[PDB]
Design a binder for this molecule. Structure first.
Ligand code: B12
Length: 577
């Protein structure tokens, strides 16, 4: 008594894949198995026909990524049922190719890699996901032992670019021949071609998103396009290299001393910085009930590869129905996590007396301002400026010689320490929809905590806007006085300053969050940065700084110039090697 239950098993398998239905997967697979001679006949035939249809529908724009992920779920359950029969048998299963994929050493975030992997498993590629913070040695060893046809590397932050070049170079040094696949939030085609590709004599390919990867992989594993595609990419990377190659209409640079002379022009003697209602460090927690109202749903839809802005995405004529069901799944997950207390957002916040000296911010033990407990270092824009200041974030804090009492805040927050454990539980159950869901929700929780806690700080701990009453949308549009710049962003690009935040707040002690050696944070779903209250403070890109700033910055930090050049590679107005 159900139309599709009445079709031949092979059409049932397809319908159940396409529709993401799991209830009859074992029995339909058990039936298909009997229908065939070798167990693997089931995967190679109806199961991949299913994924054949799924792929064409996605191609046509009749399914989107959340549904493709739900199909992958029915597929991995069929296979999980079959594995006993396949193993306890002769044959062992024809695939379209095998990839080893990893998040690079020092890097923690894996949502994007997760999605690239899932998508490739739906095209009958075997994927060996080595997880995160993966050492180059681990990656090359695994690809040998397993005989991978490709290696793919994901990275979120700037230091991961270095790790990727380091992986390329080790591949050359061991004489690897297979394609190296490059993607992730920090990666770009320009950086692949100029810095990575020349280090390896196998093909190096930047790939923008999961969807494009499928065609790249196929072009690379085909005996009639491989060569055509490789040539073409190389010819592309050569072009990219000669294009950027002569440093395209660059603004003129300035001496560090001329930059500092054109600092933010302000009248400190007429101003009275708002006085922090509270000073010191406090650990904090916020329930999922509190934090859900502060969620910015747009990057979440964006992560599930549904374009559009929330609430309107829900009405969109194309993705609206799927945006609604994605959102309903997300809210049901939040309701369980929140009722059962299995993901517990947490952070630490602090406010300190402080004052600018030069391009840094001095931070004091108490309001006598006579013992300096730490220093926040910053960079100054070093291009030539017409009218405007060559900004530096320190500029927004009362110079010490003004005699004005100023303050600085820091925070580190996480959507919850359980994130990895919850994710493994779903990985263990072959459930990629919920694995990517909880990780993407944990991230919505970290950011919601960062908005919420910033608001608590404007209104209460620092307390210079206790009557602010801003809707979620006005929060997203940043209609409030003050900023919460986060190390890594172009406005404070030096990632190692997170050490300062970790020092000032004792983050790891108070909340359990850790810094990797690239200064990524663990858990993946974490945000830390600073608080400034000045009303003219903004997120001005630091951009392109010179040797003279690198050297002076090297001195302030007790680092060698080369260590600094490495941490600031994307901001150097000169070629360091
Ligand atoms: C949402 C977001 C986050 C989230 C989650 C990040 C994420 N993975 O998306 C959280 C809130 C967790 C995060 C935190 C921070 N982030 Co943030 N984040 C953003 C934001 C707004 C969007 C990221 C996004 O597009 N995700 C979409 C997912 C689906 O895509 P993806 O990860 O890019 O991968 C896709 C493709 O890259 C490709 N792909 C991915 N990997 C691979 C691998 C292979 C082999 C292939 C073929 C393809 C491929 O397929 C994937 C899906 O199709 C951007 C700004 C921006 N507009 O991009 C920054 C941004 C990436 N993050 C940034 C930084 C600095 C931070 C923080 C360090 C800030 C801080 N807190 O001090 C922290 C670090 C967190 C940590 N270390 O644990 C900077 C990083 C760049 C840099 N180093 O300067 C960015 C670029 C913002 C900026 N303006 O600079 N942020």
């Amino acid at each position: 008594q159900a139309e599709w239950r009445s079709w031949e098993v092979n059409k049932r398998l397809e319908y159940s894949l396409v529709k993401g239905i799991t209830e009859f997967i074992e029995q339909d697979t058990e039936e298909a198995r009997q229908q065939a001679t070798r167990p693997c006949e089931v995967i190679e035939g109806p199961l991949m026909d299913g994924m054949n249809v799924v792929g064409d529908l996605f191609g046509e724009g009749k399914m989107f990524l959340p549904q493709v992920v739900k199909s992958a779920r029915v597929m991995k359950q069929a296979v999980a049922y079959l594995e006993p029969f396949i193993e306890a048998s002769k044959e062992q299963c024809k695939t379209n190719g095998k990839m080893v994929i990893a998040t690079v050493k020092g890097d923690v975030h894996d949502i994007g890699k997760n999605i690239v992997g899932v998508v490739l498993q739906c095209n009958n590629y075997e994927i060996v996901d080595l997880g995160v913070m993966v050492p180059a040695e681990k990656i090359l060893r695994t690809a040998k032992e397993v005989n991978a046809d490709l290696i793919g590397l994901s990275g979120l932050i700037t230091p991961s670019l270095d790790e990727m070049v380091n992986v390329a170079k080790e591949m050359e040094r061991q004489g690897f021949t297979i394609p190296l696949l490059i993607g992730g939030a920090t990666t770009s085609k320009a950086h692949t071609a100029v810095k990575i590709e020349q280090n390896y004599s196998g093909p190096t390919v930047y790939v923008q998103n999961a969807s494009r990867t499928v065609g790249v992989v196929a072009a690379l594993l085909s005996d009639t396009q491989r060569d055509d595609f490789v040539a073409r990419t190389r010819k592309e990377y050569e072009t990219v290299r000669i294009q950027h190659g002569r440093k395209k209409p660059r603004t003129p640079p300035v001496t560090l001393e001329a930059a500092r002379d054109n600092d933010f022009a302000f009248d400190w003697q007429a101003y009275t910085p708002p006085v922090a209602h509270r000073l010191g460090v406090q650990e904090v927690e916020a329930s999922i009930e509190t934090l859900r109202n502060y969620i910015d749903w747009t990057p979440f839809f964006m992560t599930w590869s549904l374009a559009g802005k929330y609430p309107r995405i829900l009405e969109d004529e194309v993705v609206g129905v799927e945006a609604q069901r994605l959102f309903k799944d997300a809210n049901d997950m939040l309701d369980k996590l929140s009722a059962e207390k299995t993901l517990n957002p947490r952070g630490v916040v602090g406010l300190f007396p402080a004052n600018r000296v030069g391009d840094d911010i001095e931070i004091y033990r108490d309001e006598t301002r006579t013992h300096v407990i730490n220093v926040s270092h910053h960079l100054r824009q070093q291009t030539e400026k017409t009218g405007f200041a060559n900004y530096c974030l320190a500029d927004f804090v009362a110079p010490k010689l003004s005699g004005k009492a100023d303050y600085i805040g820091a925070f580190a927050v996480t959507g919850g320490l359980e994130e990895d454990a919850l994710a493994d539980a779903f990985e263990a159950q072959h459930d990629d929809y919920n694995k990517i869901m909880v990780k993407a929700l944990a991230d919505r929780l970290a950011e919601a905590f960062a908005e919420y806690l910033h608001e608590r700080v404007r209104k209460v701990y620092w307390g210079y806007a206790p009557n602010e009453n801003l809707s979620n949308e006005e929060l997203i549009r940043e209609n409030y006085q003050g900023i919460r710049p986060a190390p890594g962003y172009p406005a404070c690009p030096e990632h190692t300053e997170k050490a300062t935040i970790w020092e000032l707040l004792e983050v790891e002690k108070h909340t359990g969050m850790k810094l990797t050696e690239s200064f990524a944070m663990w858990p993946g779903a974490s945000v830390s940065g600073w608080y400034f209250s000045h009303p003219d403070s903004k997120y001005y890109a630091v951009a392109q700084i010179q040797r003279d700033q690198v050297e002076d910055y090297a001195r302030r930090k007790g680092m060698s110039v080369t260590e600094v050049e490495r941490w600031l590679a994307p901001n150097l107005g000169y070629d360091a090697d």
